Design a protein around this ligand. Sequence first.
Ligand SMILES: *[C@@H]1O[C@H](CO[C@@H]2O[C@@H](C)[C@@H](O)[C@@H](O)[C@@H]2O)[C@@H](O[C@@H]2O[C@H](CO)[C@@H](O)[C@H](O)[C@H]2NC(C)=O)[C@H](O)[C@H]1NC(C)=O
Ligand SMILES: CC(=O)N[C@H]1[C@H](O[C@H]2[C@H](O)[C@@H](CO)OC[C@H]2O)O[C@H](CO)[C@@H](O)[C@@H]1O
Ligand SMILES: O=C(O)c1cn(C2CC2)c2cc(N3CCNCC3)c(F)cc2c1=O
Ligand SMILES: O=C(O)c1cn(C2CC2)c2cc(N3CCNCC3)c(F)cc2c1=O
Ligand SMILES: C[C@H](NC(=O)O)C(=O)O
Ligand SMILES: [Cl-]
Ligand SMILES: [Cl-]
Ligand SMILES: [Zn+2]
Length: 570
Amino acid sequence: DEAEASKFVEEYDRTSQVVWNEYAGANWNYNTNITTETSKILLQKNMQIAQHTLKYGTQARKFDVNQLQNTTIKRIIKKVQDLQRAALPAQELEEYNKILLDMETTYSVATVCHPQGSCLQLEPDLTNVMATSRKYEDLLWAWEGWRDKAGRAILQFYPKYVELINQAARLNGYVDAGDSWRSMYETPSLEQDLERLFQELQPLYLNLHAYVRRALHRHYGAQHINLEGPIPAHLLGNMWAQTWSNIYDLVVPFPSAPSMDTTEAMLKQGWTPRRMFKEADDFFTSLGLLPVPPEFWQKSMLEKPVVCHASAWDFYNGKDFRIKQCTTVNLEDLVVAHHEMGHIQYFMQYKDLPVALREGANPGFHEAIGDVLALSVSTPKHLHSLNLLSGSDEHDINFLMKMALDKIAFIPFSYLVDQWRWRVFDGSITKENYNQEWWSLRLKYQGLCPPVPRTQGDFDPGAKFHIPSSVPYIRYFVSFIIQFQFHEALCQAAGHTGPLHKCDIYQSKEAGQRLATAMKLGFSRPWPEAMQLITGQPQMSASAMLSYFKPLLDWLRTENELHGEKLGWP
Ligand SMILES: *[C@@H]1O[C@H](CO[C@@H]2O[C@@H](C)[C@@H](O)[C@@H](O)[C@@H]2O)[C@@H](O[C@@H]2O[C@H](CO)[C@@H](O)[C@H](O)[C@H]2NC(C)=O)[C@H](O)[C@H]1NC(C)=O
Ligand SMILES: CC(=O)N[C@H]1[C@H](O[C@H]2[C@H](O)[C@@H](CO)OC[C@H]2O)O[C@H](CO)[C@@H](O)[C@@H]1O
Ligand SMILES: O=C(O)c1cn(C2CC2)c2cc(N3CCNCC3)c(F)cc2c1=O
Ligand SMILES: O=C(O)c1cn(C2CC2)c2cc(N3CCNCC3)c(F)cc2c1=O
Ligand SMILES: C[C@H](NC(=O)O)C(=O)O
Ligand SMILES: [Cl-]
Ligand SMILES: [Cl-]
Ligand SMILES: [Zn+2]
């Protein structure tokens, strides 16, 4: 009966708001102010939210969605039918929540120590080393140490985690946890669509890889780089080799072009974490999008004073939104600040929907918003207007190369993480083979090799945040494809003509309008609709990303040919 379904979702909304807000508060308070007491308040709230999820989920499952007419109420009820972990029996729920905590804590407190010397944390110490050291042995110390200390220590938890996340999935009508995660896209063709998108980016990635490999051969020596092989995984300027832009200085196409180091300029001109978020906020409002409320500035944690990994927080009351980031003053982190502020923008845009529909059109959309703005921020024009820099085709290629080292290098990495996890969850990778299958994919997709042979008890996936924190990853792959589609469309709405990479949407109210109407849908409609509102068509497409990078593909092709490069590796 329609009226009874309608009433049921009104009640679910009122009560979810209250319970989720209380849970979010306790999760914040442990993420920022670890305390035995904040971790104890967190443990209580886990029990509260489970009980509410079990209560309304059991009620939701009594309705026959097949016979409901109103499509909103049908959709909401369908979501509430999925209890997630609250479907578990009590013992197993307890054990699962404790495993998640233990894994997340283990990762966040791990350190890598010199004997009779200092102990280094991932952020900022080890990331700095991976970004700035140009010495094979120093990079290897950090790369291997982080795996020895974080990765190996997550292993004891992972099999039971898999058992329990899968058990919950099956109790909610899925075959395993990857199935449940894939379901968030509501796209039966998802695996093949993504495969196709990846395949389209292979020429650009293989040409970037070959060019970077040649430059590493020049710096690290012929004895350490095989011009026909995979690249050692510790040399790309980043702990996971997921973005390569910190080795720009080793691969600059045209050295004779001046670029100012923005880090020096940011530091010397008195930039702070606070100032970095004010610039992000100011860009959103330039587009006519919403400012973050006064409360955001009061309650956010914008520096290390904790779980440091950058994250945006909805407190499910339509007024309180926060970022938690251990911000360092540099351009890499200004982009991370923009990313996080696009999550906040989304929260604010869909804040008046029912709480069950307060998500992105799909998870990739949530990830893409901030990155779209950052694309304009990162342009040489934009950096100059911020006083962080002082024409030529040589400048163009240099800029494209910088952008490519992040955006194109990330494509195979972002694709492979959940390829691994889907096969763990479906049972085709058992714990005996976790690590070998990870490295098979690191070779197949990224063309990387481990600098030190892996050994019994290694668990390199565990050294990447998203694995112990149980955060799906395919969202980031989708993000990097679709953010270029949004840029293309917003630039076209902004009246930009000429090379897409020269576009800066700063101050375009027209661009901000396309984004706002789509964000306002939250999760109320199939995501193709939001895709079409923004772009004029309903598909995920690598066309826009290829269009952005076309000058670089052509440059890289001619350069690799000149040196007789053999693209790929065995
Ligand atoms: C199908 O139902 C939605 C939801 O209606 C709201 O939620 C119900 C549970 C109940 O509380 C209703 O009184 C609410 O209206 C309808 O959506 C809304 O429509 C109103 C005006 O028509 C609009 O102002 C709201 O923003 C809409 N909210 C949404 C989309 O969540 C919807 O119109 C119903 N379908 C039709 C057209 O009959
Ligand atoms: C903040 C708020 O009150 N929003 C509600 C929402 O109600 C209305 C809202 O009054 C108007 C204007 O703000 O916009 C259309 C509706 O969304 O109702 C939601 C339940 O459907 C509730 O979650 C939300 O907090
Ligand atoms: O008991 C339950 O069913 C749930 C409990 N929790 C407790 C709060 C940890 C959840 C937490 C979720 N997230 C926390 C915010 N970031 C990631 C997602 C979630 F999506 C679902 C659930 C439940 O279903
Ligand atoms: O921010 C948070 O803490 C939560 C966020 N989410 C939403 C997903 C982002 C949740 C979703 C839950 N669901 C239960 C199962 N069916 C609907 C989804 C949940 F129980 C708890 C939470 C949170 O605590
Ligand atoms: C891309 C992803 N970003 C984020 O988690 O905020 C990562 O950092 O691996
Ligand atoms: Cl690794
Ligand atoms: Cl996802
Ligand atoms: Zn994000």
